[PDB]
Amino acid sequence: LPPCCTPPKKHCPAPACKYKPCCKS
Numbered sequence: 001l002p003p004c005c006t007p008p009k010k011h012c013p014a015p016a017c018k019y020k021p022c023c024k025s
Contacts, residue, residue: 004012005022012023 001009001016004010004017004020009017010020010022012018012020017023
């Protein structure tokens, strides 16, 4: 998937968005 750190899918509800420095940090 594309950069999770984006308006489209910024939220990190699922694991797929575990590599989101914007959500982890």
